[PDB]
Amino acid sequence: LQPVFTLKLRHKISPRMVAVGRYDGTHPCLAAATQAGKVFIHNPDVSLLNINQTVSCLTAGVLNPELGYDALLVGTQTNLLAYDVYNNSDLFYREVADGASAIVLGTLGDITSPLAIIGGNCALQGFNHEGNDLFWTVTGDNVHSLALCDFDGDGKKELLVGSEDFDIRVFKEDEIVAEMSETEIITSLCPMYGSRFGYALSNGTVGVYDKTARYWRIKSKNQAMSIHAFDLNSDGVCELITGWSNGKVDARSDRTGEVIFKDNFSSAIAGVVEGDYRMEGCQQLICCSVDGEIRGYLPIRELSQKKQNLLLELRNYEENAGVIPANTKHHTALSVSLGAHAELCISTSNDTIIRAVLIFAEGVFAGESHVVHPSVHHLSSSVRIPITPPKDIPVDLHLKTFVGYRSSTQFHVFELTRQLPRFSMYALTSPDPASEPLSYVNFIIAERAQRVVMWLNQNFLLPEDTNIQNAPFQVCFTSLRNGGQLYIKIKLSGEITVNTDDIDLAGDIIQSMASFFAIEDLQVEADFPVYFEELRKVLVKVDEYHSVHQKLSADMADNSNLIRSLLVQAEDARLMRDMKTMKNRYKELYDLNKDLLNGYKIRCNNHTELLGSLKAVNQAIQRAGHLRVGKPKNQVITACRDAIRSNNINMLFRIMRVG
Amino acid sequence: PLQHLDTLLDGTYKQVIALADAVEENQDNLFQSFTRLKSATHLVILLIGL
Amino acid sequence: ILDENAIAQVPRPGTSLKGPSPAVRPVTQAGRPITGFLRPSTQSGRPGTIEQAIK
Amino acid sequence: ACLALADFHGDGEYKLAMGDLGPDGRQPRLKVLKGHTLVSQKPLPDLPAAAVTFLMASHEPRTPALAIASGPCVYVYKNLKPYFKFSLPSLPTNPLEQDLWNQAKEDQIDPLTLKEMLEGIREKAEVPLSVQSLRFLPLELSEMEAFVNQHKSKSIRRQTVITTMTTLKKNLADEDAVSCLVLGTENKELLVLDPEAFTILAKMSLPSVPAFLEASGQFDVEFRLAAACRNGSIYILRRDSKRPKYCIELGAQPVGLVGVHKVLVVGSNQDSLHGFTYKGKRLWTVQMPAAILAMNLLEQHSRGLQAVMAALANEEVRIYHDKVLLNVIRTPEAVTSLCFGRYGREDNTLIMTTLGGGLIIKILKLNVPRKTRLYVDQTLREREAGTAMHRTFQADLYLLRLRAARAYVQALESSLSPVSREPLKLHAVVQGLGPTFKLTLHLQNTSTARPILGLVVCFLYNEVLYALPRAFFKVPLLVPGLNYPLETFVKSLSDKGISDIIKVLVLREGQSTPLLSAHINMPMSEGL
Amino acid sequence: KVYISLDQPLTALNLFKQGLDKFPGEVTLLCGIARIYEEMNNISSATEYYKEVLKQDNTHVEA
Amino acid sequence: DLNLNRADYLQVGVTSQKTMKLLPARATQKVVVGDHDGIVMCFGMKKGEAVTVFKTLPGQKIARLELGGALNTPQEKIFIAAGSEIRGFTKRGKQFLSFETNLTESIKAMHISGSDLFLSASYIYNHYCDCKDQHYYLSGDKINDVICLPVERLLREVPVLACQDRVLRVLQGSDVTYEIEVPGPPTVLALHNGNGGDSGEDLLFGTSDGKLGLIQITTSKPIHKWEIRNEKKRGGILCVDSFDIVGDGVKDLLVGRDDGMVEVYGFDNANEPVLRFDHTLSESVTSIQGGCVGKDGYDEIVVSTYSGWITGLTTEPVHKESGPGNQEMQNKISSLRSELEQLQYKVLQEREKYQQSSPSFSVNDKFTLNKDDASYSLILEVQTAIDNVLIQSDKNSAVVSFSLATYRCQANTTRLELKIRSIEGQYGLQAYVTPRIQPKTCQVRQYHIKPHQRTHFIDHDRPMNTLTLTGQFSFSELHSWVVFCMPEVPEKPPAGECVTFYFQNTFLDTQLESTYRKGEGVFKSDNISTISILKDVLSKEATKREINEVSVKHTLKLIHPKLEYQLLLAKKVQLIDALKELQVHEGNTNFLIPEYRCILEEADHLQEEYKKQPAHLERLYGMITDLFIDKFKFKGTNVKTKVPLLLEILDSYDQNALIAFFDAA
């Protein structure tokens, strides 16, 4: 197409902080963050707003439907501000203390007020037109992106959270619905379809999701900064507009990801957003660069090359009817070695050799590959690759074993898919009553101990010698990320006792057991003393962190007032060319700046410690909730939140133990 | 990060102190020159009145 | 001057703090006609620079 | 190398014109741009002054033109033949150089080769050092300026410096049957010269303020010629100097004027533009954020329907379709003229001539008061008790005269008036917070013409609160009419905030009674 | 005071009308509304609010 | 300003350099091409479809194809040279000439001037006249192309021989008259008109670094007229031709590249060139011609593509019909549909048979050395698309190389360009390429990173740290050592048993003159590092089978500006962002110091050079420490321990204290 309008804005736009909003009620304008912590507004002249603080989120929407104005939201790692730009007046200036890493604005399920959802360290929040907490839940890790999409087709939109844990979870008003495990820290989600949402990562992977599966996916360089679904070809179905790190804006399709429209810039792409600038009654598509240029749009031979490739294949087969016996089969085998890696051995029942192996896995290896290299003096039939995944998620290696002779210049590439299970580590062994972890969770299951044994064989790497009778039995496992221990005990009464000293491991095991037996509700009797004592320590320390930060901020305000007074006094002494007093003011200013810089260092240090403590508390609440399946989850979450807002720590631990 | 704002502040402070000392010395030189000029113009009025 | 807290820098005329004409009512600044009931919270205009406020 | 002209003299193939300015207004060639390949098709030399706008017709052979050269006079191009009537041809290869440029012909101008040109002024005497020619651009800046006074060879006269003209179009492709030549100079003198009798028919000086672009696109089809005053008005002063219609309706001065023979698209400085018709009615205004530098509108397909190229005053361009917005981006630091660049018989190619040197082509009933019951009750009281009011007000006026005379005499006694035969006026201003205040006495002699010789200033302060370095000093000779600021440095000594008054007495040196006085309440110290 | 310090008159006015919804005839709140209207220099409403203050107090030196 | 629409024609197999030609035929001409299997073919493109003519039988890889004619007759005889012999066809499928010209390896270039036949080889050059040997030359370097000036517009035949070492030897008979020097190894050259230049004779050359020229070879000396040395247009010129496409009246220059770039140069300045239209193609152009092949009456450019896609760039619009709502798109779509259906049927059945019963290709690689930088720029090309490229060691749209770098190529890309930066030492690089064909084979390539770009002259007035090898050499073996040790030297030992080469370090200008005879060798230099590396590597080869006391001062004075620039880079980029925070307020009217105001403008260039700075700083530190260690090693000492003090000194970088630490300890 052709850019229906273009303009150059002299201000650097922060990448993920762009919004279009009719701040005059009927006159759409652009809001975008900038350096120095200032948010600029382009009306059709640029008007600055002094946030005086490093912005981290920015959106714009309708927060009180009584009036027809868009409210400019501005999030900061410790604050959140709604702003009525027309009549400059704060709708609500809330202090989060959890951070603002990703915010949205819409209507959740069974809530009659458009919420300003937010995402911080590990906890989300929600605020109405006045700033009242109406929604709050805890998630796995740092939230990086949020969007509102009606997964499940029931007319009330659930919210999709992209955790730093590489996961995408979908949250209802209170309940969690599903979680799909992507392969890197999410960076952007965008819904415009029914239950389809487009996602981006930090690998560079831009993709599309149905309910719980990926339509398509493309991985490139220049990881996407901002994705937004629009209808460029106006075929009635939205397409994933994307703005990459180089400048390319590629409008793709929500079908198998085929590039439809393409454009380029001079710098990276800050944000792609829809909004009707030109007042034509139809939406537009504005692309805003990092360097501050805005451009707005209104809505062939390769197959012959494939034919030639097919003819080349036919040429190869006719030539047939660096050579290798045609009956060469690559056979793999997984194992685990202590004296500390999951080994994968590949061999060939011939005299042929394996010149190189290029394993391809998404999140296990650093990068996407781990090419194993054997020197010419080391070549042999069977080659072993050591693997060390960083976390327990079932991965699927796509091995490409280069098969050939010793002195060859061309040889085959045999492709083979092998899945490392979820708990690929933990080479399970014999029990040791001296080092059994004192932590324990107990819960109930339906029946069919043999079904649980099949669960073990499906989600664990048991050796072939194993065999389990229907009687109650204990299975132990040594972890291979650390030397920890795990003890699963299946009682004859149909009860289950997980005896791992790690709480995340217990959550994962219980959730997999639930999803394996189609269970909608479960309640646990849990106890993790070592973790609970440390959590109590952090909860104790939080209050003194609060007090120290308060005192430091008071002192620094005092010294800043002193410094402004000295600036005025020095300007006065300089206006009457009295240089002794001017130099004395400048000396005092130097000394005050030194003292204030020391104060800044110590405050920042205590403040980062405070953020660590808050994240610890929120992640602990989430770890408690995540241990129970179904309706008990949000029950425990809200119970712990109320038990911490009232500083009833003992009740917090009581509800985390059994409640 | 302070982004080396403190370093720019220190540099500017050094510049300000240097300029203040320069202005002080120029004020002293100007005062000496004014006194010598007063003597000279005294002599010139004397020689015109004679 | 040395303390900036207002969010909007150039807000719409009629929503920020920063009648008879000067031919009838005495004035104190370019505008701002003289008021009754001086209170110690009166700002009655503001200077532009430290030099103007001092001089 | 800054330029002035830009014009599309089409129908040859795509022949575009560009008038550059050389050392002293010279066109080395008035260069042909050839905008899609940037070469010289037909060079146009021999022009001593910056031309701005050519002129075409349907019957012309497309090579000759009309170069309105801002400088000495005008040089109409007729295939390297500038032929106007009697004063406008003025030797198109620089006549005020080449009488003395012959000494600067060994190399380019640089101060090394100039100091060997001592004999070159006097080994060849083409003129006896005439004042019109001896000092144009390249000569010695110091040594030959002492021979101008003793020679003083006389000069000639010609038509004044021009910007734009007006000419005929009907009998144009013979260049001699023209009748009216109404050109616009800088002193707003559109002289009307006629070659049928070698006469001056008229002169248009009714603005008597300089136009920017005199003729809205060199003419109008209705001949409603549009002169633009540099005051904030645009005139409808017709062709051949008819009776004026004048639309003053502009908020500020107009910047840049072209026309598309239907409308008058002027600039402004109140951040807009105004589209006026031939009669003075505003057809359509357009709002822009900044001031405008130069506009235009392209060819007409319907009655003037294409894009407007409107630059700004902060390096920005802004393109429009009158109602719908297209572009804001930052190419030209300044600009001269925006015209066609059309090649290959396409629709439209745009050109842009910046002032750094480039040639850019980039595409993207009244208020009577009312009286209440209070007024009628007050008037009734006045009508029933007027005598007592009169008597008591006269008594109060007598007592007021008494007390005012009393206070005036007491002030004269203490000599506390800062305004008081013996004319003077003094007032003391205090500046600065902190322990050191600057105290400047503004003193003034207020007399017709009489200075005051012997006066002196003495300060009265509390020697425990303020440390005045020189509490007594003579004042300069006060010339009638000048405010003398005589300043001192007061310094607060009290560790506690104490505000005490300071008196100032101005007095003669032979008398002991102060001529006048002043008071200053020193503010608080704000010490340390 | 806090809102006026952040240069937000229209927030302070809404807060004052909220307070008057709580305290139906407070004189200090009406006087603050009138002070804000006079700082914004639209006397046609400051006189109305000072007249309300008068209807409440009638000895108010300010109004 | 010019626009050319990309209309595609018949696709042939993979083609070498200059393997396409146009028969002169006022209507549409005919295209003739040669595949790497020997199947020379010709078509006319009557209406949309290629009406093939005399598509011959497969043979050796067609290395060159040229059309000529004996007399002034319209030249129509098309000669090819596949393996070792020159075959010749008329303007139809009748072979008439088959000159065996029994040689050793192959032909790499050939020119037909009527009956005269000038052919090249790896090193050999022959001039025959109707199957009769008349001239024979053996250059010291490989030949890239041979041409003979017009024997009609002039009188003598002066064949020019473009060598690999940046020279054009304009030889007559069997001995060189003189040699013209040109920047970069020449790859193509052709007289720059249908005659050879109006003003007598002119030779237009194009080099592999990317450079054009108009060497006017007179009887005894060349007259350089202009050069098109480029900056952004890197890429080896594989083809060039003259044709008037713009239509001004003077012939334009249609030049191809190695990165797809096709360019037209007009001479609107009446003596010098200027670019008019450029277009990328995603593959490597191998031949360019003018004229018209489709829809006579509109001049167009025919471009032979490496994989064989004989494309055209026409001056005629494509949207012939438009209304309320073209059809040729639908026709081509339907044809490709049917063909892909039937081919899928056949190849699926054959895949079934092959799997139940259970391919060589070409990679035009180019391991050149960028001179403006110190980084080789490897460029792989495959006829099909690649799937993944391994890089094992001892413009690109591909993915991350993090792992031994494995690069996957997204979508349907043929060529892959990747940089490789190697230090002044560390000699010893494999690359496995896999295409997107069905058996999915892999082909390995072994490049060498040698232990210095070779030039033609040095400066002997520099402090030369000579070094002499003596004893028991076969001159061929010593030459093999120098080939093992130096980037650009011919493998075949040059005749005469005495050879001298003039090298030059590209990271900083220090020459490495190398002279050697049957049993002796002198390796002069301006660097201690170079001669130390040479000593070590030559001693290693042997085991397998003097100092100017001011040279260190000269090398340190050479290095000093680079380290100064890097440190100033760091110092400015430290404050760039802090100053930018101040820039956003108060508009910068009166306050900012001019010093930092000089940085506020060039902040962008400073920031984008800071990204590359750390590599340059580490390389400079390594070079300095190697220089120090070696210049102490020559005296017989071992100073591998004083390195950390040198590192600290460089963190300080007092140049005078640096030279003091060099001379003292």
Same domain membership, residue F647 and residue F620: yes
Chain centroid to CA F628: 36
The pairing of beta strand F30-34 with beta strand F40-43 = antiparallel
From its phi and psi, is residue F297 left (phi > 0), alpha (psi between -120 and 50) or beta? left
* Residue pair F397/A246 in contact by the 8 Å Cβ criterion: no
Can you tell me the distance from the alpha carbon of D158 to that of D185, in angstroms, rounded to the nearest whole number? Answer: 12
3-state helix, strand, coil in chain F (%, to 5): 25, 30, 45
* Residue pair D253/D232 in contact by the 8 Å Cβ criterion: yes
* Residue pair F446/F433 in contact by the 8 Å Cβ criterion: no
Q: Which residues of C touch A52 (CB under 8 A)?
A: 4
Tally A–C CB contacts below 8 A: 40
DSSP F217-283: E-SS-EE---B---SS--S----EEEE--S-SSS-EEEE--SSS-EEEEE-TTSSS-EEEEEE--SS
Within a 13 Å sphere around the CA of F146, how many CA atoms are in the beta-carbon half? Answer: 30
Same domain membership, residue F554 and residue F462: no
* Other Cβ atoms closer than 10 A to A11: 19
Which residue among D328, D364, D434 places its CB closest to the CB of A572?
Answer: D434
Q: Chain A interface, mutation test: which of D324, D429, D487, most A Cβ atoms within 10 Å?
A: D324
* Other Cβ atoms closer than 10 A to F51: 12
Q: Do C8 and A568 touch (CB under 8 A)?
A: no
Tally C–E CB contacts below 8 A: 32
3-state helix, strand, coil in chain E (%, to 5): 70, 0, 30
Tally A–F CB contacts below 8 A: 127
Q: Which residues of F touch A571 (CB under 8 A)?
A: none
In sequence order, the 6+-apart residues with CB closer than 8 A to the CB of F1 are D36, D37, D343, D344, D349, F276
> Domain boundary at F521, F547, F573, which?
F547
Same domain membership, residue F593 and residue F475: no
* CB contact A398 to F (< 8 Å): no
Which chains would you list as touching A if contact means 3+ CB atom pairs under 8 Å?
B, C, D, E, F
Q: Do C15 and A85 touch (CB under 8 A)?
A: no
Q: Which residues of D touch C10 (CB under 8 A)?
A: none
Classify F37 as helix, strand or coil. Answer: coil
In sequence order, the 6+-apart residues with CB closer than 8 A to the CB of F290 are F22, F241, F242, F243, F244, F245, F254, F299, F300, F301, F302
* CB contact E11 to A (< 8 Å): yes
Q: Do E10 and A87 touch (CB under 8 A)?
A: yes
* Other Cβ atoms closer than 10 A to F348: 11
Method: cryo-EM
The residue of chain F nearest to residue A404, with distances taken between CA atoms, is F442
D521, exposed or middle or buried, with CB in 10 Å at 0-12, 13-18, 19+?
A: exposed
| Residue appearing with tokens 């969770």 | A441
Q: Which domain holds residue F591?
A: 548-665
On whether A154 is known to bind a ligand per the annotation, the reply is yes
> What letter represents residue C32's amino acid?
R
Find residues 432-491 of chain A whose CB sits inside 8 Å of chain F.
Answer: none
Query: Residue A383 phi/psi, 5° resolution?
Result: -125, 140
Q: Do A590 and B13 touch (CB under 8 A)?
A: yes
Q: Which residues of A touch C54 (CB under 8 A)?
A: 568, 571-572, 575
Query: Residue D61 phi/psi, 5° resolution?
Result: -80, 10
Same domain membership, residue F164 and residue F103: yes
Domains of chain F: total = 4
Chain centroid to CA F571: 38
On whether A595 is known to bind a ligand per the annotation, the reply is no
Helices A579-625 and A529-575 pack at an angle, to 10 degrees, of 160
For chain C, the residues before each gap (C–N > 2.5 Å) are 18
Q: Which of D425, D430, D415, D416 is nearest to D521 (CA)?
A: D430
Residue F340 lies in a domain: no
Tokens of F616: 């340059």
Q: Chain D interface, mutation test: which of C21, C24, C51, C55, most D Cβ atoms within 10 Å?
A: C55
Strand partners, A402: A356, A413
Q: Which of D278, D248, D280 is nearest to D263 (CA)?
A: D278
On whether A591 is known to bind a ligand per the annotation, the reply is no
Can you tell me the distance from the alpha carbon of D478 to that of D346, in angstroms, rounded to the nearest whole number? Answer: 78
| Residue appearing with tokens 């002066």 | F158
Which residue among A86, A564, A575 places its CB closest to the CB of C2?
Answer: A564
Q: What torsion do the CA atoms of D379, D383, D389, D393 make, to the nearest 10 degrees?
A: 70
Which residue among E6, E39, E43 places its CB closest to the CB of C6?
Answer: E6
H helix or E strand, kind and range, residue A496: strand A495-498
* CB contact A87 to E (< 8 Å): yes
| Residue appearing with tokens 């020095």 | A570
Q: Which residues of F touch D36 (CB under 8 A)?
A: 1
DSSP D400-448: HHHHHHHHHHHHHHHT--S------EEEEEEE-SSSEEEEEEEEE--SS
* Residue pair A309/A328 in contact by the 8 Å Cβ criterion: no
Per-domain residue ranges for chain D? Answer: 1-90+160-364, 365-420, 421-528
- Give me the sign of the Cα torsion angle A122, A128, A131, A134: negative
Same domain membership, residue F411 and residue F265: no
Same domain membership, residue F315 and residue F173: yes
| Residue appearing with tokens 């009188």 | F155
Strand-by-strand arrangement of the F159-163 sheet: F143-148, F159-163, F167-172, F175-181
Residue F335 lies in a domain: no
* CB contact A215 to B (< 8 Å): no
Q: Do D434 and A3 touch (CB under 8 A)?
A: no
* CB contact E10 to C (< 8 Å): yes
The residue of chain C nearest to residue A565, with distances taken between CA atoms, is C2
Classify F494 as helix, strand or coil. Answer: coil
Q: Which residues of D touch C54 (CB under 8 A)?
A: 431-433
* CB contact C19 to E (< 8 Å): yes
Q: Do E61 and C37 touch (CB under 8 A)?
A: yes
Same domain membership, residue F428 and residue F301: no
D222, exposed or middle or buried, with CB in 10 Å at 0-12, 13-18, 19+?
A: middle
Which residue among E9, E43, E61 places its CB closest to the CB of C17?
Answer: E9
* CB contact E42 to A (< 8 Å): no
Q: Do F577 and B8 touch (CB under 8 A)?
A: no
> Domain boundary at F321, F343, F370, which?
F321
* Maximum Cα–Cα distance across chain B: 76
* CB contact A89 to E (< 8 Å): yes
Residue F369 lies in a domain: no
Q: Do F1 and D39 touch (CB under 8 A)?
A: no
The residue length of chain B stands at 50
On whether A235 is known to bind a ligand per the annotation, the reply is yes
Q: Which residues of D touch C55 (CB under 8 A)?
A: 431
Q: Chain A interface, mutation test: which of C4, C7, C49, C51, most A Cβ atoms within 10 Å?
A: C7
Helices E43-56 and E27-39 pack at an angle, to 10 degrees, of 160
Same domain membership, residue F633 and residue F517: no
Which residue among D324, D325, D438 places its CB closest to the CB of A576?
Answer: D438
Chain centroid to CA A44: 35
On whether A309 is known to bind a ligand per the annotation, the reply is no
Within a 13 Å sphere around the CA of F310, how many CA atoms are in the beta-carbon half? Answer: 29
**CA dist list (Å): F640 to A296, F201, F546, F655:** 62, 62, 22, 21
Strand partners, D27: D47
| Residue appearing with tokens 């230049």 | F197
Q: Do A88 and C3 touch (CB under 8 A)?
A: no
The residue of chain A nearest to residue C2, with distances taken between CA atoms, is A564
Within a 13 Å sphere around the CA of D88, how many CA atoms are in the beta-carbon half? Answer: 26
CA E26 to chain A, closest CA, distance in angstroms equals 24
| Residue appearing with tokens 């420490």 | F625
* Other Cβ atoms closer than 10 A to B3: 15
Query: Residue A466 phi/psi, 5° resolution?
Result: -65, 155
Chains F and B touch (3+ CB pairs under 8 A): yes
Can you tell me the distance from the alpha carbon of F56 to that of F78, in angstroms, rounded to the nearest whole number? Answer: 13
* Other Cβ atoms closer than 10 A to D296: 21
Classify D273 as helix, strand or coil. Answer: strand
> Domain boundary at F321, F354, F385, which?
F321
> What letter represents residue A54's amino acid?
T
Could you give the angle at the alpha carbon of D197 between the alpha carbons of D196 and D199, nearest 5°?
120
Q: Do F350 and A317 touch (CB under 8 A)?
A: yes
In sequence order, the 6+-apart residues with CB closer than 8 A to the CB of D433 are A568, A569, A572, C54, D523, D526
Helices (H) and strands (E) in chain F, counts: 8, 39
**CA dist list (Å): B28 to A572, A579, F415:** 21, 12, 76
